[PDB]
Design a protein around this ligand. Structure first.
Ligand SMILES: O=S(=O)(c1ccc(F)cc1)N1CCNCC1
Ligand SMILES: O=S(=O)(c1ccc(F)cc1)N1CCNCC1
Ligand SMILES: [Zn+2]
Ligand SMILES: [Zn+2]
Length: 582
Protein backbone atom coordinates (compact mmCIF):
# COMPACT_ATOMS: atom_id res chain seq x y z
CA UNK A 1 0.00 0.00 0.00
CA UNK A 2 1.14 3.59 0.88
CA UNK A 3 4.91 2.71 0.99
CA UNK A 4 4.69 2.00 -2.85
CA UNK A 5 2.22 4.82 -3.91
CA UNK A 6 2.95 7.47 -1.13
CA UNK A 7 5.88 9.20 -2.95
CA UNK A 8 3.76 9.74 -6.14
CA UNK A 9 0.89 11.06 -3.91
CA UNK A 10 3.34 13.16 -1.73
CA UNK A 11 4.84 14.77 -4.93
CA UNK A 12 1.31 15.69 -6.24
CA UNK A 13 0.27 17.17 -2.81
CA UNK A 14 3.20 19.71 -3.03
CA UNK A 15 2.63 20.91 -6.69
CA UNK A 16 -0.97 21.90 -5.60
CA UNK A 17 -0.39 22.92 -1.88
CA UNK A 18 -2.64 26.03 -2.54
CA UNK A 19 -5.61 23.57 -3.15
CA UNK A 20 -5.17 20.22 -1.20
CA UNK A 21 -8.33 19.08 0.73
CA UNK A 22 -9.49 15.57 1.85
CA UNK A 23 -13.00 16.19 0.31
CA UNK A 24 -15.87 14.37 2.18
CA UNK A 25 -18.39 14.21 -0.79
CA UNK A 26 -16.08 11.82 -2.85
CA UNK A 27 -18.14 9.37 -5.01
CA UNK A 28 -15.56 6.46 -4.92
CA UNK A 29 -16.61 3.09 -3.39
CA UNK A 30 -14.01 0.63 -4.88
CA UNK A 31 -11.05 3.05 -5.52
CA UNK A 32 -9.00 4.18 -2.46
CA UNK A 33 -9.21 8.04 -2.31
CA UNK A 34 -6.37 10.31 -1.13
CA UNK A 35 -7.29 13.98 -1.82
CA UNK A 36 -8.40 16.60 -4.41
CA UNK A 37 -6.98 19.87 -5.93
CA UNK A 38 -8.12 22.68 -8.36
CA UNK A 39 -8.13 22.50 -12.24
CA UNK A 40 -10.48 23.83 -15.05
CA UNK A 41 -10.64 22.34 -18.64
CA UNK A 42 -12.17 19.37 -20.66
CA UNK A 43 -12.11 17.12 -28.23
CA UNK A 44 -15.39 16.16 -30.08
CA UNK A 45 -15.62 14.25 -33.43
CA UNK A 46 -15.27 16.61 -36.49
CA UNK A 47 -16.73 15.83 -39.98
CA UNK A 48 -14.40 15.03 -42.97
CA UNK A 49 -15.89 17.33 -45.71
CA UNK A 50 -14.10 15.53 -48.61
CA UNK A 51 -15.65 12.11 -47.68
CA UNK A 52 -19.09 13.64 -46.84
CA UNK A 53 -19.34 15.58 -50.17
CA UNK A 54 -18.63 12.27 -52.08
CA UNK A 55 -21.18 10.19 -50.03
CA UNK A 56 -24.33 12.40 -50.46
CA UNK A 57 -26.97 9.56 -50.29
CA UNK A 58 -25.78 8.81 -46.69
CA UNK A 59 -26.62 12.45 -45.60
CA UNK A 60 -30.23 11.23 -44.85
CA UNK A 61 -29.26 7.86 -43.21
CA UNK A 62 -29.42 8.34 -39.40
CA UNK A 63 -27.15 5.34 -38.63
CA UNK A 64 -24.40 7.30 -40.54
CA UNK A 65 -25.25 10.91 -39.53
CA UNK A 66 -25.74 10.20 -35.76
CA UNK A 67 -22.17 8.67 -35.55
CA UNK A 68 -20.67 12.22 -35.89
CA UNK A 69 -22.84 13.78 -33.06
CA UNK A 70 -22.17 14.19 -29.28
CA UNK A 71 -19.54 3.12 -18.19
CA UNK A 72 -17.47 4.96 -15.46
CA UNK A 73 -19.87 3.12 -13.04
CA UNK A 74 -18.09 -0.06 -14.34
CA UNK A 75 -14.56 1.32 -13.49
CA UNK A 76 -15.91 1.86 -9.87
CA UNK A 77 -16.82 -1.90 -9.42
CA UNK A 78 -14.88 -4.78 -7.70
CA UNK A 79 -14.05 -8.42 -8.75
CA UNK A 80 -14.11 -11.18 -6.04
CA UNK A 81 -10.98 -13.32 -5.27
CA UNK A 82 -11.09 -16.55 -7.36
CA UNK A 83 -11.22 -19.89 -5.38
CA UNK A 84 -8.05 -21.99 -4.66
CA UNK A 85 -8.71 -24.51 -7.49
CA UNK A 86 -9.13 -21.59 -10.02
CA UNK A 87 -5.91 -19.82 -8.78
CA UNK A 88 -3.97 -23.14 -9.21
CA UNK A 89 -5.41 -23.72 -12.78
CA UNK A 90 -4.43 -20.13 -13.75
CA UNK A 91 -0.85 -20.43 -12.28
CA UNK A 92 -0.15 -23.83 -13.96
CA UNK A 93 -1.59 -22.62 -17.33
CA UNK A 94 0.24 -19.25 -17.21
CA UNK A 95 3.61 -20.97 -16.35
CA UNK A 96 3.12 -23.36 -19.32
CA UNK A 97 2.02 -20.55 -21.74
CA UNK A 98 5.01 -18.20 -21.06
CA UNK A 99 7.34 -21.21 -21.68
CA UNK A 100 5.60 -22.00 -25.03
CA UNK A 101 5.64 -18.33 -26.12
CA UNK A 102 9.34 -18.13 -25.01
CA UNK A 103 10.62 -21.31 -26.87
CA UNK A 104 11.52 -19.43 -30.14
CA UNK A 105 11.79 -15.80 -28.79
CA UNK A 106 14.24 -13.92 -26.48
CA UNK A 107 13.00 -11.19 -24.11
CA UNK A 108 15.05 -7.95 -24.53
CA UNK A 109 14.86 -4.18 -23.76
CA UNK A 110 13.54 -1.78 -26.39
CA UNK A 111 15.79 1.26 -27.06
CA UNK A 112 15.63 5.09 -26.73
CA UNK A 113 16.38 4.85 -30.49
CA UNK A 114 13.30 2.58 -31.21
CA UNK A 115 11.13 4.83 -28.93
CA UNK A 116 12.52 8.06 -30.56
CA UNK A 117 11.78 6.51 -34.02
CA UNK A 118 8.21 5.54 -32.91
CA UNK A 119 7.46 9.17 -31.75
CA UNK A 120 8.93 10.57 -35.07
CA UNK A 121 6.39 8.49 -37.16
CA UNK A 122 3.02 8.94 -35.28
CA UNK A 123 2.13 5.91 -33.07
CA UNK A 124 -0.79 6.49 -30.58
CA UNK A 125 1.41 5.94 -27.43
CA UNK A 126 -1.27 7.62 -25.21
CA UNK A 127 0.90 10.42 -23.64
CA UNK A 128 0.02 13.99 -22.30
CA UNK A 129 1.05 17.55 -23.51
CA UNK A 130 3.45 20.57 -20.05
CA UNK A 131 7.27 21.33 -20.15
CA UNK A 132 7.44 20.33 -23.92
CA UNK A 133 4.67 20.88 -26.57
CA UNK A 134 4.58 17.43 -28.32
CA UNK A 135 6.33 14.02 -27.96
CA UNK A 136 8.62 14.93 -30.95
CA UNK A 137 10.25 17.82 -28.91
CA UNK A 138 10.69 16.02 -25.49
CA UNK A 139 12.57 13.18 -27.33
CA UNK A 140 15.08 15.69 -28.91
CA UNK A 141 16.09 17.22 -25.48
CA UNK A 142 18.65 15.70 -23.01
CA UNK A 143 16.64 17.28 -20.09
CA UNK A 144 13.72 14.84 -20.70
CA UNK A 145 16.16 11.85 -20.78
CA UNK A 146 17.65 13.05 -17.39
CA UNK A 147 14.05 12.95 -15.95
CA UNK A 148 13.74 9.42 -17.50
CA UNK A 149 17.21 8.54 -15.99
CA UNK A 150 16.01 9.74 -12.52
CA UNK A 151 12.84 7.53 -12.67
CA UNK A 152 14.84 4.58 -14.14
CA UNK A 153 17.29 4.59 -11.14
CA UNK A 154 14.27 4.92 -8.75
CA UNK A 155 12.73 1.78 -10.47
CA UNK A 156 16.08 -0.20 -10.09
CA UNK A 157 15.88 0.96 -6.39
CA UNK A 158 12.29 -0.53 -6.26
CA UNK A 159 10.57 2.94 -5.98
CA UNK A 160 8.36 5.25 -8.21
CA UNK A 161 7.89 9.10 -8.19
CA UNK A 162 6.28 10.18 -11.53
CA UNK A 163 4.46 7.06 -13.04
CA UNK A 164 0.83 8.33 -12.58
CA UNK A 165 -2.25 7.64 -14.81
CA UNK A 166 -4.66 10.39 -16.08
CA UNK A 167 -8.20 8.95 -16.75
CA UNK A 168 -10.56 9.96 -19.67
CA UNK A 169 -17.57 0.88 -22.53
CA UNK A 170 -14.15 2.70 -22.77
CA UNK A 171 -11.59 4.37 -20.39
CA UNK A 172 -8.11 5.46 -21.71
CA UNK A 173 -5.32 6.01 -19.11
CA UNK A 174 -2.80 8.55 -20.57
CA UNK A 175 0.68 8.80 -18.85
CA UNK A 176 3.58 11.29 -19.27
CA UNK A 177 5.90 10.29 -22.19
CA UNK A 178 8.67 9.37 -19.65
CA UNK A 179 6.53 6.70 -17.85
CA UNK A 180 5.49 5.38 -21.34
CA UNK A 181 9.21 5.11 -22.30
CA UNK A 182 10.03 2.99 -19.21
CA UNK A 183 6.96 0.76 -19.95
CA UNK A 184 8.13 0.40 -23.65
CA UNK A 185 11.78 -0.33 -22.61
CA UNK A 186 10.69 -3.18 -20.27
CA UNK A 187 7.66 -4.76 -22.10
CA UNK A 188 7.74 -3.41 -25.72
CA UNK A 189 9.42 -6.66 -26.84
CA UNK A 190 6.02 -8.44 -26.64
CA UNK A 191 4.77 -6.30 -29.58
CA UNK A 192 8.08 -5.29 -31.28
CA UNK A 193 9.20 -9.01 -31.58
CA UNK A 194 5.69 -10.40 -32.35
CA UNK A 195 5.19 -12.73 -29.29
CA UNK A 196 1.42 -12.95 -30.24
CA UNK A 197 1.92 -13.64 -34.01
CA UNK A 198 -0.06 -16.77 -35.09
CA UNK A 199 3.30 -18.59 -35.89
CA UNK A 200 4.59 -18.00 -32.33
CA UNK A 201 1.39 -18.14 -30.11
CA UNK A 202 -0.89 -20.50 -32.30
CA UNK A 203 -4.05 -18.66 -30.97
CA UNK A 204 -2.85 -15.08 -31.63
CA UNK A 205 -3.40 -12.91 -34.75
CA UNK A 206 -0.97 -10.01 -33.94
CA UNK A 207 0.39 -8.55 -37.23
CA UNK A 208 -1.89 -10.81 -39.36
CA UNK A 209 -4.01 -8.14 -41.17
CA UNK A 210 -7.79 -7.97 -41.86
CA UNK A 211 -7.19 -9.81 -45.22
CA UNK A 212 -5.92 -12.90 -43.28
CA UNK A 213 -8.45 -13.09 -40.39
CA UNK A 214 -11.20 -14.76 -42.48
CA UNK A 215 -8.75 -17.38 -43.86
CA UNK A 216 -7.65 -18.03 -40.22
CA UNK A 217 -11.30 -18.56 -39.08
CA UNK A 218 -11.93 -20.90 -42.09
CA UNK A 219 -8.80 -22.94 -41.04
CA UNK A 220 -10.16 -23.22 -37.42
CA UNK A 221 -13.56 -24.34 -38.94
CA UNK A 222 -11.78 -27.33 -40.64
CA UNK A 223 -10.92 -28.89 -37.21
CA UNK A 224 -13.22 -31.71 -36.03
CA UNK A 225 -15.32 -30.54 -33.06
CA UNK A 226 -18.34 -28.58 -31.85
CA UNK A 227 -19.84 -25.16 -32.72
CA UNK A 228 -17.64 -22.04 -32.99
CA UNK A 229 -18.03 -19.94 -29.79
CA UNK A 230 -17.47 -16.17 -29.74
CA UNK A 231 -18.52 -14.98 -26.28
CA UNK A 232 -17.78 -11.28 -25.51
CA UNK A 233 -16.69 -10.44 -21.89
CA UNK A 234 -18.59 -7.60 -20.13
CA UNK A 235 -15.90 -4.88 -19.53
CA UNK A 236 -12.77 -7.09 -19.86
CA UNK A 237 -10.26 -4.42 -18.59
CA UNK A 238 -12.34 -3.94 -15.35
CA UNK A 239 -12.38 -7.79 -14.76
CA UNK A 240 -8.54 -8.23 -14.68
CA UNK A 241 -7.84 -9.54 -11.11
CA UNK A 242 -4.70 -9.15 -8.96
CA UNK A 243 -4.26 -12.95 -9.64
CA UNK A 244 -4.28 -12.19 -13.45
CA UNK A 245 -1.61 -9.39 -12.96
CA UNK A 246 0.61 -11.86 -10.92
CA UNK A 247 0.38 -14.56 -13.66
CA UNK A 248 1.21 -11.91 -16.35
CA UNK A 249 4.29 -10.79 -14.26
CA UNK A 250 5.74 -14.38 -14.61
CA UNK A 251 7.12 -13.26 -18.04
CA UNK A 252 9.93 -11.71 -15.81
CA UNK A 253 10.98 -15.35 -14.91
CA UNK A 254 12.38 -15.51 -18.52
CA UNK A 255 14.43 -12.29 -18.26
CA UNK A 256 17.91 -11.53 -16.74
CA UNK A 257 20.05 -8.59 -15.51
CA UNK A 258 18.80 -4.94 -15.70
CA UNK A 259 15.83 -5.93 -17.98
CA UNK A 260 14.50 -8.34 -15.29
CA UNK A 261 14.64 -5.58 -12.61
CA UNK A 262 13.16 -2.87 -14.94
CA UNK A 263 10.17 -5.21 -15.89
CA UNK A 264 9.52 -6.34 -12.24
CA UNK A 265 9.31 -2.59 -11.36
CA UNK A 266 6.75 -1.83 -14.15
CA UNK A 267 4.56 -4.78 -12.88
CA UNK A 268 4.99 -4.10 -9.07
CA UNK A 269 4.90 -0.26 -9.02
CA UNK A 270 2.62 0.75 -11.98
CA UNK A 271 0.38 -2.33 -12.78
CA UNK A 272 -0.26 -4.04 -9.38
CA UNK A 273 -0.32 -0.58 -7.66
CA UNK A 274 -1.66 2.46 -9.60
CA UNK A 275 -2.13 6.21 -8.91
CA UNK A 276 -4.74 7.94 -11.13
CA UNK A 277 -5.97 11.54 -11.58
CA UNK A 278 -9.65 12.01 -12.71
CA UNK A 279 -11.74 15.15 -13.58
CA UNK A 280 -14.97 15.69 -11.51
CA UNK A 281 -17.40 18.57 -12.45
CA UNK A 282 -18.27 19.16 -8.70
CA UNK A 283 -14.00 21.06 -12.11
CA UNK A 284 -11.45 19.51 -9.62
CA UNK A 285 -8.80 16.67 -9.86
CA UNK A 286 -9.13 13.48 -7.68
CA UNK A 287 -6.07 11.30 -6.76
CA UNK A 288 -7.29 7.67 -6.37
CA UNK A 289 -5.42 4.31 -6.20
CA UNK A 290 -6.21 0.57 -6.69
CA UNK A 291 -4.31 -2.72 -7.04
CA UNK A 292 -6.30 -4.47 -9.85
CA UNK A 293 -7.95 -3.82 -13.27
CA UNK A 294 -6.03 -3.16 -16.49
CA UNK A 295 -4.30 0.23 -16.78
CA UNK A 296 -1.21 -0.02 -19.03
CA UNK A 297 -0.29 1.56 -22.39
CA UNK A 298 -2.75 0.34 -25.07
CA UNK A 299 -0.06 -1.78 -26.90
CA UNK A 300 1.13 -3.63 -23.73
CA UNK A 301 -2.59 -3.89 -22.75
CA UNK A 302 -3.23 -5.67 -26.10
CA UNK A 303 -0.48 -8.34 -25.55
CA UNK A 304 -1.33 -9.04 -21.87
CA UNK A 305 -5.10 -9.15 -22.69
CA UNK A 306 -4.26 -11.74 -25.45
CA UNK A 307 -2.12 -13.75 -22.93
CA UNK A 308 -4.80 -13.80 -20.16
CA UNK A 309 -7.60 -14.54 -22.70
CA UNK A 310 -5.57 -17.48 -24.15
CA UNK A 311 -5.12 -18.75 -20.55
CA UNK A 312 -8.85 -18.33 -19.66
CA UNK A 313 -10.06 -20.07 -22.87
CA UNK A 314 -7.65 -23.06 -22.43
CA UNK A 315 -9.03 -23.48 -18.86
CA UNK A 316 -12.61 -23.27 -20.22
CA UNK A 317 -11.64 -25.98 -22.76
CA UNK A 318 -10.15 -28.12 -19.88
CA UNK A 319 -13.46 -27.73 -17.96
CA UNK A 320 -15.54 -28.88 -20.95
CA UNK A 321 -13.24 -31.93 -21.50
CA UNK A 322 -13.56 -33.00 -17.80
CA UNK A 323 -9.83 -32.49 -16.94
CA UNK A 324 -10.79 -31.15 -13.44
CA UNK A 325 -14.14 -31.58 -11.57
CA UNK A 326 -14.34 -28.50 -9.27
CA UNK A 327 -12.84 -24.96 -8.95
CA UNK A 328 -13.06 -25.25 -5.12
CA UNK A 329 -9.84 -27.33 -4.96
CA UNK A 330 -7.44 -28.96 -7.46
CA UNK A 331 -6.33 -32.36 -5.98
CA UNK A 332 -2.69 -33.56 -6.35
CA UNK A 333 -3.69 -35.97 -9.21
CA UNK A 334 -5.83 -33.28 -11.03
CA UNK A 335 -2.71 -30.99 -11.07
CA UNK A 336 -0.74 -33.78 -12.86
CA UNK A 337 -3.78 -34.38 -15.18
CA UNK A 338 -3.85 -30.59 -16.06
CA UNK A 339 0.00 -30.47 -16.54
CA UNK A 340 -0.25 -33.64 -18.70
CA UNK A 341 -3.15 -32.27 -20.86
CA UNK A 342 -1.04 -29.09 -21.57
CA UNK A 343 2.09 -31.16 -22.60
CA UNK A 344 -0.02 -33.69 -24.64
CA UNK A 345 -2.64 -31.45 -26.43
CA UNK A 346 -2.02 -27.79 -25.26
CA UNK A 347 -0.58 -26.68 -28.67
CA UNK A 348 -3.49 -28.41 -30.58
CA UNK A 349 -6.04 -26.67 -28.26
CA UNK A 350 -4.37 -23.22 -28.85
CA UNK A 351 -4.70 -23.79 -32.65
CA UNK A 352 -8.52 -24.19 -32.13
CA UNK A 353 -8.68 -20.47 -31.15
CA UNK A 354 -8.35 -16.99 -32.71
CA UNK A 355 -7.66 -14.42 -29.96
CA UNK A 356 -7.19 -10.65 -30.36
CA UNK A 357 -6.94 -9.07 -26.89
CA UNK A 358 -10.38 -9.54 -25.19
CA UNK A 359 -11.89 -10.88 -28.49
CA UNK A 360 -11.98 -14.69 -29.03
CA UNK A 361 -13.30 -17.42 -31.32
CA UNK A 362 -12.95 -21.00 -29.99
CA UNK A 363 -13.78 -24.30 -31.81
CA UNK A 364 -13.67 -26.76 -28.87
CA UNK A 365 -13.39 -30.58 -29.08
CA UNK A 366 -17.25 -30.79 -28.61
CA UNK A 367 -20.25 -28.76 -27.27
CA UNK A 368 -19.70 -29.58 -23.52
CA UNK A 369 -17.75 -26.25 -23.71
CA UNK A 370 -21.10 -24.33 -24.05
CA UNK A 371 -22.13 -25.16 -20.41
CA UNK A 372 -18.57 -25.21 -18.92
CA UNK A 373 -18.95 -21.89 -17.02
CA UNK A 374 -17.64 -22.39 -13.42
CA UNK A 375 -13.95 -21.43 -14.06
CA UNK A 376 -14.88 -18.62 -16.57
CA UNK A 377 -17.31 -16.99 -14.04
CA UNK A 378 -14.93 -17.57 -11.05
CA UNK A 379 -11.95 -15.97 -12.96
CA UNK A 380 -14.31 -12.90 -13.27
CA UNK A 381 -14.62 -13.17 -17.11
CA UNK A 382 -18.48 -12.89 -17.05
CA UNK A 383 -20.07 -13.07 -20.54
CA UNK A 384 -21.92 -9.99 -21.96
CA UNK A 385 -25.72 -10.12 -22.76
CA UNK A 386 -26.47 -13.65 -21.31
CA UNK A 387 -27.46 -14.84 -17.76
CA UNK A 388 -24.51 -16.16 -15.74
CA UNK A 389 -25.43 -19.91 -15.95
CA UNK A 390 -27.20 -19.95 -19.38
CA UNK A 391 -25.17 -22.11 -21.83
CA UNK A 392 -23.31 -20.23 -24.64
CA UNK A 393 -24.95 -20.26 -28.10
CA UNK A 394 -22.39 -21.31 -30.76
CA UNK A 395 -22.14 -20.62 -34.52
CA UNK A 396 -22.57 -23.47 -37.04
CA UNK A 397 -21.05 -21.50 -39.98
CA UNK A 398 -17.63 -19.75 -39.88
CA UNK A 399 -19.05 -17.08 -42.31
CA UNK A 400 -21.52 -15.94 -39.54
CA UNK A 401 -18.98 -15.80 -36.60
CA UNK A 402 -18.20 -12.24 -35.38
CA UNK A 403 -14.46 -11.38 -34.83
CA UNK A 404 -12.59 -7.99 -34.57
CA UNK A 405 -15.91 -6.14 -35.44
CA UNK A 406 -16.21 -8.10 -38.80
CA UNK A 407 -17.71 -11.17 -40.42
CA UNK A 408 -16.16 -12.95 -43.42
CA UNK A 409 -17.52 -13.96 -46.87
CA UNK A 410 -16.26 -16.71 -49.26
CA UNK A 411 -16.17 -14.98 -52.69
CA UNK A 412 -15.47 -16.91 -55.94
CA UNK A 413 -13.62 -15.07 -58.75
CA UNK A 414 -14.90 -15.56 -62.36
CA UNK A 415 -11.64 -17.59 -62.87
CA UNK A 416 -12.54 -20.10 -60.04
CA UNK A 417 -10.05 -18.85 -57.36
CA UNK A 418 -11.38 -18.27 -53.79
CA UNK A 419 -11.16 -15.00 -51.78
CA UNK A 420 -12.09 -14.89 -48.06
CA UNK A 421 -12.99 -11.22 -47.52
CA UNK A 422 -13.68 -9.02 -44.47
CA UNK A 423 -17.10 -7.29 -44.13
CA UNK A 424 -19.23 -5.25 -41.72
CA UNK A 425 -22.46 -3.26 -41.99
CA UNK A 426 -21.69 -0.54 -44.62
CA UNK A 427 -23.31 2.26 -42.51
CA UNK A 428 -20.51 1.70 -39.91
CA UNK A 429 -17.77 1.95 -42.63
CA UNK A 430 -19.18 5.15 -44.23
CA UNK A 431 -19.98 6.76 -40.86
CA UNK A 432 -16.38 6.17 -39.59
CA UNK A 433 -14.72 7.54 -42.82
CA UNK A 434 -16.85 10.78 -42.41
CA UNK A 435 -15.18 11.52 -39.02
CA UNK A 436 -11.82 13.07 -37.98
CA UNK A 437 -10.32 13.81 -34.50
CA UNK A 438 -8.37 16.95 -33.42
CA UNK A 439 -7.88 20.60 -34.51
CA UNK A 440 -5.94 22.54 -37.23
CA UNK A 441 -6.74 20.23 -40.20
CA UNK A 442 -5.85 21.94 -43.49
CA UNK A 443 -7.97 21.05 -46.59
CA UNK A 444 -4.95 19.04 -47.89
CA UNK A 445 -4.64 17.05 -44.60
CA UNK A 446 -8.44 16.41 -44.66
CA UNK A 447 -8.25 15.22 -48.33
CA UNK A 448 -5.25 12.92 -47.55
CA UNK A 449 -7.24 11.30 -44.63
CA UNK A 450 -10.12 10.77 -47.08
CA UNK A 451 -7.64 9.08 -49.47
CA UNK A 452 -6.46 6.75 -46.61
CA UNK A 453 -10.11 5.57 -46.11
CA UNK A 454 -10.64 5.22 -49.91
CA UNK A 455 -7.48 3.06 -50.37
CA UNK A 456 -8.49 0.88 -47.33
CA UNK A 457 -11.90 0.36 -49.02
CA UNK A 458 -10.23 -0.59 -52.39
CA UNK A 459 -8.06 -3.21 -50.59
CA UNK A 460 -10.41 -4.70 -47.92
CA UNK A 461 -14.00 -3.85 -49.08
CA UNK A 462 -13.70 -3.90 -52.95
CA UNK A 463 -16.54 -6.49 -52.89
CA UNK A 464 -19.09 -3.80 -51.67
CA UNK A 465 -20.50 -2.00 -54.79
CA UNK A 466 -21.01 1.36 -52.98
CA UNK A 467 -17.48 1.40 -51.40
CA UNK A 468 -15.62 0.49 -54.62
CA UNK A 469 -17.48 3.38 -56.37
CA UNK A 470 -16.97 5.87 -53.44
CA UNK A 471 -13.26 4.86 -53.17
CA UNK A 472 -12.74 5.51 -56.92
CA UNK A 473 -14.58 8.89 -56.57
CA UNK A 474 -12.42 10.01 -53.58
CA UNK A 475 -9.15 8.91 -55.35
CA UNK A 476 -10.32 10.86 -58.48
CA UNK A 477 -11.10 13.98 -56.34
CA UNK A 478 -7.78 14.15 -54.40
CA UNK A 479 -4.59 15.08 -56.31
CA UNK A 480 -2.94 11.81 -57.51
CA UNK A 481 0.51 12.51 -55.89
CA UNK A 482 -0.86 13.57 -52.44
CA UNK A 483 0.18 10.97 -49.80
CA UNK A 484 -2.48 9.30 -47.62
CA UNK A 485 -2.19 10.50 -43.98
CA UNK A 486 -3.54 9.60 -40.50
CA UNK A 487 -2.95 11.15 -36.99
CA UNK A 488 -3.43 7.64 -35.30
CA UNK A 489 -2.06 4.35 -36.85
CA UNK A 490 -3.40 -4.70 -38.10
CA UNK A 491 -1.06 -4.07 -41.13
CA UNK A 492 -1.73 -0.85 -43.18
CA UNK A 493 -0.98 -1.84 -46.84
CA UNK A 494 -3.30 0.96 -48.13
CA UNK A 495 -0.97 3.64 -46.69
CA UNK A 496 1.08 4.10 -49.94
CA UNK A 497 1.13 6.11 -53.26
CA UNK A 498 1.67 2.85 -55.25
CA UNK A 499 -1.13 1.94 -57.75
CA UNK A 500 -3.98 0.16 -55.77
CA UNK A 501 -4.29 -2.63 -58.43
CA UNK A 502 -0.55 -3.50 -57.84
CA UNK A 503 -1.13 -3.49 -54.04
CA UNK A 504 -4.32 -5.62 -54.44
CA UNK A 505 -2.34 -8.21 -56.50
CA UNK A 506 0.49 -8.32 -53.89
CA UNK A 507 -1.92 -8.78 -50.91
CA UNK A 508 -4.64 -11.07 -52.36
CA UNK A 509 -2.57 -13.14 -54.89
CA UNK A 510 1.28 -12.98 -54.61
CA UNK A 511 1.72 -12.98 -50.76
CA UNK A 512 -1.57 -14.84 -49.97
CA UNK A 513 -0.55 -18.31 -48.62
CA UNK A 514 -4.12 -19.67 -49.24
CA UNK A 515 -3.90 -18.83 -53.06
CA UNK A 516 -1.99 -21.63 -54.96
CA UNK A 517 -2.42 -20.07 -58.50
CA UNK A 518 -0.33 -16.83 -58.58
CA UNK A 519 -1.65 -15.52 -61.97
CA UNK A 520 -1.86 -11.69 -61.54
CA UNK A 521 -5.19 -9.87 -62.08
CA UNK A 522 -4.87 -7.38 -65.04
CA UNK A 523 -7.86 -5.09 -64.20
CA UNK A 524 -10.42 -4.20 -61.50
CA UNK A 525 -13.20 -5.83 -63.66
CA UNK A 526 -11.66 -9.30 -62.89
CA UNK A 527 -12.20 -8.59 -59.11
CA UNK A 528 -15.68 -9.76 -57.99
CA UNK A 529 -18.46 -8.28 -55.79
CA UNK A 530 -20.68 -10.04 -53.23
CA UNK A 531 -24.06 -11.13 -54.74
CA UNK A 532 -26.44 -8.14 -55.16
CA UNK A 533 -28.80 -9.48 -52.41
CA UNK A 534 -25.87 -10.18 -49.97
CA UNK A 535 -24.52 -6.61 -50.65
CA UNK A 536 -28.00 -5.22 -49.71
CA UNK A 537 -28.12 -7.52 -46.57
CA UNK A 538 -24.78 -5.97 -45.46
CA UNK A 539 -26.18 -2.35 -45.90
CA UNK A 540 -25.70 -1.51 -49.68
CA UNK A 541 -27.96 1.23 -51.10
CA UNK A 542 -28.08 -0.45 -54.59
CA UNK A 543 -31.69 -0.34 -55.92
CA UNK A 544 -32.43 3.04 -54.21
CA UNK A 545 -33.19 6.15 -56.36
CA UNK A 546 -30.77 8.28 -54.17
CA UNK A 547 -27.91 5.79 -54.94
CA UNK A 548 -28.68 5.58 -58.72
CA UNK A 549 -28.58 9.42 -59.04
CA UNK A 550 -25.30 9.53 -57.03
CA UNK A 551 -23.66 6.86 -59.27
CA UNK A 552 -24.94 8.44 -62.56
CA UNK A 553 -23.82 11.99 -61.56
CA UNK A 554 -20.54 11.02 -59.73
CA UNK A 555 -18.31 13.21 -62.05
CA UNK A 556 -20.29 16.30 -60.84
CA UNK A 557 -19.48 15.38 -57.17
CA UNK A 558 -15.82 14.67 -58.04
CA UNK A 559 -15.66 18.10 -59.84
CA UNK A 560 -17.20 19.88 -56.78
CA UNK A 561 -14.34 18.60 -54.57
CA UNK A 562 -11.65 19.31 -57.27
CA UNK A 563 -12.97 22.94 -57.53
CA UNK A 564 -12.59 23.37 -53.72
CA UNK A 565 -9.01 21.91 -53.58
CA UNK A 566 -8.11 23.91 -56.76
CA UNK A 567 -5.85 23.56 -59.85
CA UNK A 568 -3.81 20.39 -59.01
CA UNK A 569 -2.99 17.24 -61.02
CA UNK A 570 -5.87 14.68 -60.76
CA UNK A 571 -6.45 11.19 -62.31
CA UNK A 572 -9.92 9.86 -63.33
CA UNK A 573 -10.22 6.36 -61.72
CA UNK A 574 -13.99 5.91 -62.59
CA UNK A 575 -13.34 4.10 -66.01
CA UNK A 576 -11.69 1.19 -63.96
CA UNK A 577 -15.43 0.28 -63.41
CA UNK A 578 -17.47 -1.31 -66.31
CA UNK A 579 -20.38 1.25 -66.08
CA UNK A 580 -18.07 4.37 -66.59
CA UNK A 581 -15.93 2.58 -69.24
CA UNK A 582 -17.78 4.41 -72.14
O1 LIG B 1 -1.67 18.50 -45.00
S1 LIG B 1 -0.71 17.44 -44.96
O2 LIG B 1 -1.09 16.10 -45.29
C1 LIG B 1 0.62 17.89 -46.02
C2 LIG B 1 1.50 16.91 -46.46
C3 LIG B 1 2.61 17.28 -47.20
C4 LIG B 1 2.79 18.60 -47.48
F1 LIG B 1 3.87 18.96 -48.23
C5 LIG B 1 1.93 19.58 -47.07
C6 LIG B 1 0.81 19.22 -46.35
N1 LIG B 1 -0.11 17.41 -43.43
C7 LIG B 1 0.64 18.59 -42.97
C8 LIG B 1 0.49 18.72 -41.48
N2 LIG B 1 0.68 17.43 -40.79
C9 LIG B 1 1.27 16.40 -41.67
C10 LIG B 1 0.46 16.14 -42.94
O1 LIG C 1 -33.25 -9.26 -55.56
S1 LIG C 1 -33.12 -8.21 -54.59
O2 LIG C 1 -32.62 -8.51 -53.29
C1 LIG C 1 -32.11 -6.95 -55.29
C2 LIG C 1 -31.30 -6.19 -54.46
C3 LIG C 1 -30.53 -5.17 -55.00
C4 LIG C 1 -30.60 -4.96 -56.35
F1 LIG C 1 -29.88 -3.92 -56.88
C5 LIG C 1 -31.37 -5.71 -57.20
C6 LIG C 1 -32.14 -6.72 -56.65
N1 LIG C 1 -34.62 -7.57 -54.39
C7 LIG C 1 -35.70 -8.18 -55.18
C8 LIG C 1 -36.91 -7.27 -55.16
N2 LIG C 1 -37.33 -7.01 -53.79
C9 LIG C 1 -36.26 -6.36 -53.05
C10 LIG C 1 -35.03 -7.25 -53.01
ZN1 LIG D 1 7.82 5.19 -11.91
ZN1 LIG E 1 -21.11 -8.88 -45.14
Amino acid sequence: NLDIIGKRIEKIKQEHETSWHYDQDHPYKTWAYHGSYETKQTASSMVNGVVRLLTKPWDIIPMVTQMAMTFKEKVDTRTQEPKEGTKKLMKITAEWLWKELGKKKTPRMCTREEFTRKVRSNAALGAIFNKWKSAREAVEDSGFWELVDKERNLHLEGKCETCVYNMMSRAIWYMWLGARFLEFEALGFLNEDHWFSRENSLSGVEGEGLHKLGYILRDVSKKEGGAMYADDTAGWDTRITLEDLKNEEMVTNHMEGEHKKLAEAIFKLTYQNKVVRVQRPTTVMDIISRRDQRGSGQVVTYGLNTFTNMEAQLIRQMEGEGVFKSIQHLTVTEEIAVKNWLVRVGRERLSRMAISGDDCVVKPLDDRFASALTALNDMGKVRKDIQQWEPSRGWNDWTQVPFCSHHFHELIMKDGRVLVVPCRNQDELIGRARISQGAGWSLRETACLGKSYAQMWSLMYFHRRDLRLAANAICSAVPSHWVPTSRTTATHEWMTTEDMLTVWNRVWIQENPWMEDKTPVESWEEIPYLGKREDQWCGSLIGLTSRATWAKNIQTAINQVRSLIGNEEYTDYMPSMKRFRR
